[model samples]
Target chain A: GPSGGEVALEHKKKIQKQLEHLKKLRKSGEEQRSYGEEKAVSFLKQTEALKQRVQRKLEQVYYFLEQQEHFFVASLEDVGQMVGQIRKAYDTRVSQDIALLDALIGELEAKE
Target chain B: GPSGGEVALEHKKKIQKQLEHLKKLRKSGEEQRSYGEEKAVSFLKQTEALKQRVQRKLEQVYYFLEQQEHFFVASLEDVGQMVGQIRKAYDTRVSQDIALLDALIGELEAKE
Candidate 1:
C-alpha cells in the first residue's frame, strides 16, 4: 500500500548530494597536500640558492682579507656590494619561506 | 549453533584489533599536523630574528659608509665581522628551514 518508488527517489537524491560533498572534501585535502609539496620544493630551490650565495659571499670576503693588501676605496666598496647582495638574497628567500610556512600552517589548522 | 560461541569470541577480538589500528592511524595524523604547526612556528621565530639581523647589518654598513671618513684597518675589520654574522644567521635559519621543508614533504608523501 506504501509508495516504495517515491521512497527510493528521496534516497537517491540524498545519496547524490552526499556523494558530491564527499568528493569535494577529499579533493580539497588532496590539493592541499599537493600544494604543500610544491611549496616545499620551491622553497628548497631558493634555500639552496641562498646557501650557495652565502657561502660564496663568505669566501669572497675571506679571500679578500687574506690578501692583507692596503685598504682601498674599491675594496671597501666591494665589501659593501657583497653585503648588499647577501642581504638581498636573504630577504628574497626568507620572505618566501615565511609565506610558505604560513600557508602550511593554515592548511593544517583548517583540518583541526 | 555448536560453533556460535566461538564465532562471537573471534569477532570480538577482531573488532578490538581493528579499533586499535584505526586509532593509531588517526593519532599519527593528528600528531603530524600538530608537529608541522610547531615547526612552522619555531621556524617563523628564527626567520624573524634573521631578518632583523640582516636589516641591522645593512643599516650598520650604511651608517659606516655615510661617515665618508678615512678608512682604517679596524673599520674594514668591522665590515668583515658584520659579514660573518650575516652569513652565520643566514646559515642557521636556512638550514632549519630546509629541514622543516623536508619533514613536511615527508609527512605529506607518506599519506600519498
Candidate 2:
C-alpha cells in the first residue's frame, strides 16, 4: 500500500492544498508533451535562462583552462572550482526540473 | 483483473479521450523522431531550456557565497535547496521516462 503510489492521508491533504493554487489553470496549451505547457512559458523561460547562463560560464572556464599558464589560487583556479560546483549544482537543478515536470504530467494525465 | 497494469474500462476510456486531443494537434511525429518529430522536440526544448535556467539562479547564489564568506546560509542556499528538491523530482521523471522508453523499445523489439 505504501509503495505503489498510495499516500498517507496527511500527505494527500498537503498535496491537495498545494494543488488548489494551480486548479484554475486551464489545459489549452498546444505543447502537450512539454513542461512549459503544464506550467507557463515564463516559468520555463526563467528555467531556460538559468541553463544558458551556466553553459556560458562553463565555456569561460574551458577558455581559461586552455589559456592558463601556471594555475594557482587565481582567476583560472577559482573559476575552475566554481564550474565544478556549478556542475554539481546543475545536476541537482536538472533533477528538480524533471521532477516537477513528472509530477505535473501525472496530475495532468489524471485530471478529467 | 484489477491486479495488473490493466485499469478499469472507465479509466481506459478517459485516457483515450485525452490521447485523441493530443493526436488532433497534427504531429506526424512517429517513433522515427525526425524533423517531423515536433512533439518530441518541443518536449525536449522546454526541458533543456529549464535546465539552463535553474543553472543561472544558482550562479547568483554561488556569487553571494563567495562574497559574504560568512557563517550565514550559503550564497548558493536556495539554489542548492531547490536543486535538491528538483533533483529528487527528476528521479521520478527519469524513472517514468525510462519506463515509457523501455515499453516502446520492448514493443518494437517484439514486433519483428
Candidate 3:
C-alpha cells in the first residue's frame, strides 16, 4: 500500500549507518585480496548473519507501513467524491511523487 | 543472505528515474531565480513530505523478506545438520543474487 518508494527510503535511513559499515567491509573485500581468504570467509559468515537480523527488522517496519498506505489510498477513494478531490487524495496519498516529478519535467519541457 | 546489496539495488532500480527527475529540479530551482524564495520553500516542503511517504513503502518490502531469513536460519540451526546446510541456505540466497549480479560485475572484475 505504501508505495514501494516510501518503504525503500525508510530502509535507507534506518540502515544508513550499518550499511556504511557493510559497504566498507565489502569494498575491502573487493580491493584487498590480502584478507581475501580468511577475512572474506569470516566477513561472509558475519554478513549472512547480519542480513538475517536486518530482514526481521525490515518486516516490522514494512507491515504497518503497508497497511497505512492501503488505508490512506482507500480513504481517498471512498471519502472523496469529486474528481479533483479524489485526485488530490491520490496525490496527497500516492501521487505526490509522480505528480511533482511530472511538474518538474513539464517545467523542463517549457524551458526547452 | 539476500544481502543489503540486493535490497538497495532493487530500490535503486525502482526509483532510479524519479530520483533523476528530483535531481534536475533543484538544479533548475537554483538557475531560474525567478521562482525565487517562495517556490524554493515549497519545493523543500514537498521533498520532505515525499521523504515521509517513501518511509512507509520501505517497511513492506523489508518485512516478509526478513521473516524468510529467520525461518531459514532456525531450520538450519534447529534441525540436526552440518554447518554446511546453514552455509548452503545462505549460499543459495546469495547465489540467486550473485547469479544476477555476476553477469553485471563480471566484466568489471575481469577488467581489473
CA lDDT for candidate 3? 0.63
CA lDDT scores, all candidates in order: 0.63, 0.56, 0.63
- Weakest 10 consecutive residues of candidate 1 chain A by summed lDDT: A66-75
Q: Looking at model 3, give its docking quality level.
A: incorrect
Please rank every candidate by lDDT, starting with the best: 1, 3, 2
- Ranking, TM-score, top scorer first: 1, 3, 2
TM-score of each candidate? Answer: 0.32, 0.21, 0.21
Error of 3 at B18 (Å): 49
- Model 1 alpha-carbon miss at residue A45, Å: 53
Report how far residue B42 has shifted in candidate 2, in Å: 80
**lDDT value, residue B35 of candidate 3:** 39
Error of 2 at A102 (Å): 99
Q: Write the per-residue lDDT of candidate 3 for residues A1-112, one digit (tens) a residue.
A: 9899999997787567555545665665454455335555865686688687767767776786788788677645643354455356445533555577777678669868
Cα RMSD (Å) between model 2 and the true structure?
Answer: 50.4
* Candidate 3 segments exceeding 4 Å error: A1-66, A71-112, B1-40, B56-64, B80-112
lDDT by residue (tens digit), candidate 2, A1-112 = 5654556766787567545433322221222335434445645666677668667766876775455434333544655675576568556655655665565478677873
RMSD of each: 52.4, 50.4, 42.2
lDDT (tens digit, per residue) of candidate 2 on B78-99: 4567657656865675565556
